[PDB]
């Protein structure tokens, strides 16, 4: 085509504005940070009936007291393993404590978005800014639970309840009235699975999705297939008792 330095008629890059199309091609995930814990989850779906969901990780862990997720291509998800996970350990290497979620996100965004045509000192060799939507959540030692997100455009915003993926248009619309300040951990476990039911194209299964949580004491803990199936049975019993 032409030089990457070409902007939009509004003065923005093309790869930044077009980075939202690669997110819809990924998996739909909705994070929620309640008063008790922070609800994390994704959607594995299926690429085949012989697909194994045990060895695939769509939800990673940067540090014990925090968590992370991904929606998009899995290539950029490992770029923060050498950056976000390194910066979290670098903080413990210097200040030896839990990094603030508010400061960590902006610190990651410095290591997250770097690109361009070329530069001697900094590495601009990266072409596409992001191919994945990364979620950033955890607990702050001062404020509290904070749910942030790494956007494919590179910016960052404070999200009380965040929805990403292809179904983020219809899920976030109803999410306004669903999220409340009184929403607890147990009440938010059946709420996410109920929203993902209208999202997921197939029957809810332990291998078609993965959920986890962020605890201020035990830390990031994944939900095992035996435990995930329990939340599935609780959803079928809850939906039948609504009417």
């Amino acid at each position: 085509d032409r030089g990457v330095s070409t902007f939009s008629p509004e003065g923005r890059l093309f790869q930044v504005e077009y980075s939202l199309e690669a997110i819809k091609l990924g998996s739909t995930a909705i994070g929620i940070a309640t008063k008790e814990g922070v609800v994390l989850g994704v959607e594995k779906r299926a690429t085949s009936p012989l697909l194994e969901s045990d060895s695939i990780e769509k939800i990673v862990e940067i540090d014990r007291h925090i968590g992370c997720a991904m929606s998009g291509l899995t290539a950029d998800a490992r770029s923060m393993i050498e950056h976000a996970r390194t910066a979290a350990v670098t903080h413990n290497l210097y200040y030896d404590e839990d990094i603030n979620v508010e400061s960590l996100t902006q610190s990651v965004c410095d290591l997250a978005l770097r690109f361009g045509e070329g530069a001697s000192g900094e590495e601009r060799l990266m072409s596409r800014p992001f191919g994945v939507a990364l979620l950033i959540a955890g607990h702050d030692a001062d404020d509290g639970y904070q749910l942030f997100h790494a956007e494919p455009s590179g910016t960052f915003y404070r999200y009380n309840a965040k929805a990403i993926g292809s179904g983020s248009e219809g899920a976030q619309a109803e999410l306004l009235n669903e999220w409340h300040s009184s929403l607890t951990l147990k009440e938010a476990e059946l709420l996410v699975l109920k929203i993902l039911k209208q999202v997921m194209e197939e029957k809810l299964d332990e291998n078609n999705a993965q959920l986890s949580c962020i605890t201020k004491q035990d830390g990031f803990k994944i939900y095992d297939n035996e435990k995930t199936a329990e939340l599935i049975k609780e959803l079928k019993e809850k939906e039948a008792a609504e009417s």
């Binding site: 085509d1 032409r2 093309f14 199309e21 819809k24 091609l25 292809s166 248009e169 219809g170 194209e201």
Partner: protein, 370 residues
Amino acid sequence: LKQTENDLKDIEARIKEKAGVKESDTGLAHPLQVARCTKIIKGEDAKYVINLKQIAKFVVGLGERVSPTDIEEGMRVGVDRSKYNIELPLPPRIDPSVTMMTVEEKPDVTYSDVGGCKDQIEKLREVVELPLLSPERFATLGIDPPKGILLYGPPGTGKTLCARAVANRTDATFIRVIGSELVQKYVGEGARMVRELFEMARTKKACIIFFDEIDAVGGARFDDGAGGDNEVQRTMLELITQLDGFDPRGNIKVMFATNRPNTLDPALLRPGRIDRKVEFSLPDLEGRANIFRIHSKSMSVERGIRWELISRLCPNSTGAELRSVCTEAGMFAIRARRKVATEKDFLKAVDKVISGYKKFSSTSRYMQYN
């Protein structure tokens, strides 16, 4: 044997038709190329005799008085060559000469893509339909409806389908002229001959003409052409002449078609021959949900089908690309022999058509600005 007995009353009425010919019986025996009569026997100055042909070229400086008492001799007197006006005795003037004109009736096209065209069609309605409803708001406010408008995007994905659908509800004269055949050879065949259509547009009202294939007309130049495209570029400038000195915008509309907006001459794209531009791109998801309804209005579908999960498999697309999903879905009922259209046919078609069949060969990076 209808025509056999129809001439019985017609031959008897032929003399009655000859009674009108009995006015001028000289020289043996309204569209015209050039005004031509025989000697103009009928005809300061009193009688007026002017003819332009290979023999006896005539010119008269005066006029505007009654010599002939309306039609005379060869019946053809009036506008030709321009420069020449016989008005006062009921003229057959400003009439289409020998030429090639495409004129059809009732270009019926239904709705195609309403997804992003909600307020986008309203801009098209403000072009034609608006002055045909409340013209009083133009003189009071001091504003005029848009004349020129540009169509850019992929080749007929529901953009062009919307252009022909709105024209059917205008209930006016529809004329289609393209730019590919417009080239030809002789200078003026693509400009002066089409200028006659532009001049007739001011004569005959309630006319709507869509200019087609502007890529074969306009375009940007650097070395100022390799030759042969000058008349192609002069036709672009001839379109400016009709909009240059004077022109009413009430009965005359201008609409282009192309695949990219800025590929024309950057001086051509300048405003005043285009008041508004049609921005055509890939609309949102829930907006195109009516497209699945339009194709299913006349289509038998099994009750209980869920369109929410079907739209999730389909990424951002256009109106025509959604019909291709239902087109192959109709073929699923041919081979596999399905009674009606089921949910499994639609869920598989998206992966069969878009993912499976479509693959390469689509317009993606070919539009930025230029």
